[PDB]
């Protein structure tokens, strides 16, 4: 494993994209996810 090169910071310059779809899901014991 290499260096994360990571910081716990906030960049307000960061792009604000993405949708907010209300999604209905059943969980899996494996960790995956279901539909309806």
């Amino acid at each position: 494993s290499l260096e994360k090169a990571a910081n716990v910071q906030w960049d307000e310059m960061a792009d604000i994209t993405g949708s907010s779809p209300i999604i209905e899901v059943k969980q899996d014991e494996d960790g995956s996810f279901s539909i309806r």
Partner: protein, 582 residues
Amino acid sequence: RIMQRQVGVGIHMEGVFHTMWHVTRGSVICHETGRLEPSWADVRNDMISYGGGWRLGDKWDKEEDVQVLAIEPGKNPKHVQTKPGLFKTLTGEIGAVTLDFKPGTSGSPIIKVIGLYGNGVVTKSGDYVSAITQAERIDYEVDEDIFRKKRLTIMDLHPGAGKTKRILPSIVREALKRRLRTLILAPTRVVAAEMEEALRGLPIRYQTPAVKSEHTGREIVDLMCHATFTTRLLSSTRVPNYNLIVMDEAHFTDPCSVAARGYISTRVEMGEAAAIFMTATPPGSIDPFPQSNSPIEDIEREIPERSWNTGFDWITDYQGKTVWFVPSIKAGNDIANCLRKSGKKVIQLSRKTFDTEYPKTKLTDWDFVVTTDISEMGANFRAGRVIDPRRCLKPVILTDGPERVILAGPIPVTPASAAQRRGRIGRNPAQEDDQYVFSGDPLKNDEDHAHWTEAKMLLDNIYTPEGIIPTLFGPEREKTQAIDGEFRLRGEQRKTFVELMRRGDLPVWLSYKVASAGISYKDREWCFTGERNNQILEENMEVEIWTREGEKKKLRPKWLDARVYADPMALKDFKEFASGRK
């Protein structure tokens, strides 16, 4: 973080490691620093934590626009921003950030960190959405001043709470800071070896039972087995007055360990020492299904006691490694052979073959392990299933008529025993939960066990500043109404008794009988002057022994302990003893 042969990025917070599950699946990675190690894993939340438990807490506000700190393979870490939606699980509601990156960017921090980006869904109708998956933060830390005299401290340490890797070395370090004559008592040498490895760097001296006492002014810490500690109390007045005694696996019912507990407890009451008894099953607990590190699947179904023909397909259909607890070595042989007939390769374990076979269970890749009660104490495995009929053999002293020690069984185990056999799994996080397959229920009453009496035989033969009488441990002294010091031997008989156990490899009871009979150690006449019913059989034939003289006599001991002919090795040693060889 990248692994090549980046599939996932991790986060190191509060000293511990936090990452997704499907990116690593539980594999250890070494940095320039010390190598990592898994600790906790929830597949349902797809989370994993190395070197410690989850250490960051919930903070999704269901209204605040959170953001992901992306880390993509091939280039720099980018930063975004999102107004997350609702992921409506039937049980509860969890935040959902609609986002997408190239495969291997899972474990990106969210904004402190409130989630781990990675696990998501792909609607064929629309785009791919991700879930703000994070578990509830949860512990064990630095211990207090339990080093104060006249104070016994019991630690209910369950596997694997870092008892050996974290806690014990921390206690030792603090003990050395306070300049204490620390004593460390491990049940077996293999455990002691795991300690001296875990105590690497620290001044730790492992003690051999070949040495009656060893002392140095450049004060170190004495690490020895329970039996070593007891025999040194029986063989030397030069016993150090330790002010801190730490007994690991203090639930041990072996006479040496019980006697050690009684002595240590006595030294505590005197106010010359502080005690620490570490065990997952303290003498005041009866739960055979204790809470473990990783989830355990408890399955009750009947289990083969002998060789089986057909029916039990569930045994062999299992593909992982398996640990199986048998009452005796012979029953174990029967099971092992029936297992090898089916293709599986089995490693067999017992009390006097452990140091020979246990290292194989690490190096060798095996399908099954058949074991007696010896694995209940500090025996770690990398298996995933424990098969436990909860049956065992118990030494019992019959007083009806002539006194003799028999092996009653296969009698159901004790609750602590069942908890320990079960405790062999449920610590290593795998994708499939560990299965504790068992049969029947344990029995609380074990106060007809010979080891309690043997423990007192050892206890009131220990030289002590008199002063007082070395009595048994508190929670265990009610398991025998034998009067204190009624097994006291004086002078020559005491030396003969210790020699009979140490150089004769004979059980405490039998040794006490021969010693208190005024019999010299080299005298072997008592092995042939017994009742016709005291005749010993070896594979359905009467044993005939060629003595030291060169004479041939039928093996018929004056006192009969079933533990000298219960096993081919045990009988072999006992026949070597009767022939005056050792």
